Amino acid sequence: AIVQGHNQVIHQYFDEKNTSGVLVIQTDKKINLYGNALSRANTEYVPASTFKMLNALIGLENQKTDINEIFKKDMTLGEAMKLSAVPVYQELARRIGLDLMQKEVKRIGFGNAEIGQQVDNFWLVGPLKVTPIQEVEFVSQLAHTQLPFSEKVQANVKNMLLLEESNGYKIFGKTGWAADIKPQVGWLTGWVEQPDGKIVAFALNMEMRSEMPASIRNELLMKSLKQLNII
Numbered sequence: 001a002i003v004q005g006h007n008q009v010i011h012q013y014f015d016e017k018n019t020s021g022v023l024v025i026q027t028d029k030k031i032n033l034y035g036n037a038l039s040r041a042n043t044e045y046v047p048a049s050t051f052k053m054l055n056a057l058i059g060l061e062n063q064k065t066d067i068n069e070i071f072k073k074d075m076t077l078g079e080a081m082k083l084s085a086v087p088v089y090q091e092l093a094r095r096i097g098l099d100l101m102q103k104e105v106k107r108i109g110f111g112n113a114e115i116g117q118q119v120d121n122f123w124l125v126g127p128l129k130v131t132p133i134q135e136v137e138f139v140s141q142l143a144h145t146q147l148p149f150s151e152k153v154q155a156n157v158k159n160m161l162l163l164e165e166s167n168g169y170k171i172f173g174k175t176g177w178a179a180d181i182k183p184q185v186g187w188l189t190g191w192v193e194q195p196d197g198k199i200v201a202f203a204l205n206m207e208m209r210s211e212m213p214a215s216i217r218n219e220l221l222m223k224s225l226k227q228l229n230i231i
């Protein structure tokens with residue numbers, strides 16, 4: 001059920017950036033693998049900023065914040081979803097607390113579900129790790145309102161993840177970059193809502209280097225989605 005797709009062209013997209021990457025695509029429970037390092041799909045990596053999605057779900061579900069709260073630029077949880085915003089989501093993680101965080105991460109079963117003893121950095125340097133296949137499954141469940149959280153909480157977090165609209169397609173997702181571990185890990189995890197309402201989920205995972213532009217992840221994602229006729 002998890003197979004290499006028609007990967008002739010996309011393999012070369014990653015080769016031209018001289019790095020190792022995988023793109024996982026999930027349609028209705030069919031998963032296909034693309035890129036030039038397909039073994040990455042079942043390899044565990046720190047989630048980095050992609051964990052903000054689950055942090056937000058947990059914080060909103062447990063009424064540790066709400067979508068209108070202004071965190072002292074002064075900004076909301078949703079505004080902070082796009083930005084670096086280490087202070088907002090670190091503050092939210094401290095409000096949740098280590099015990100509730102570990103309980104929720106175990107209930108969701110996210111990755112290896114281990115968060116250690118420091119509630120405000122376990123997603124960046126370990127010990128929490130997750131595979132790209134696990135990330136695409138998680139975000140597919142979010143997109144379909146199938147996670148075990150309030151429907152309204154899931155809708156509110158989805159609304160924070162809109163990256164852009166084009167020609168009737170909506171692209172939702174979340175970037176991550178673990179720059180302080182070696183090798184560095186880059187993420188772009190999300191989904192496409194096609195004009196007729198169909199959902200196609202993706203998880204891009206690649207080795208980063210410090211000279212790369214952050215936009216390299218979106219660049220590779222968009223050219224691959226176009227080649228696959230997903231957009």
Ligand SMILES: *C(=O)[C@H]([C@@H](C)O)[C@H]1C[C@@H](SCC/N=C\N)C(C(=O)O)=N1
Nearest residue numbers: 048049084086175176177178179214
């Ligand atoms: C999450 O992955 C990042 C922080 C919150 O941990 C957040 C910030 C930027 S990375 C900043 C450094 N750039 C290169 N080393 C980011 C991202 O671009 O995905 N996410």
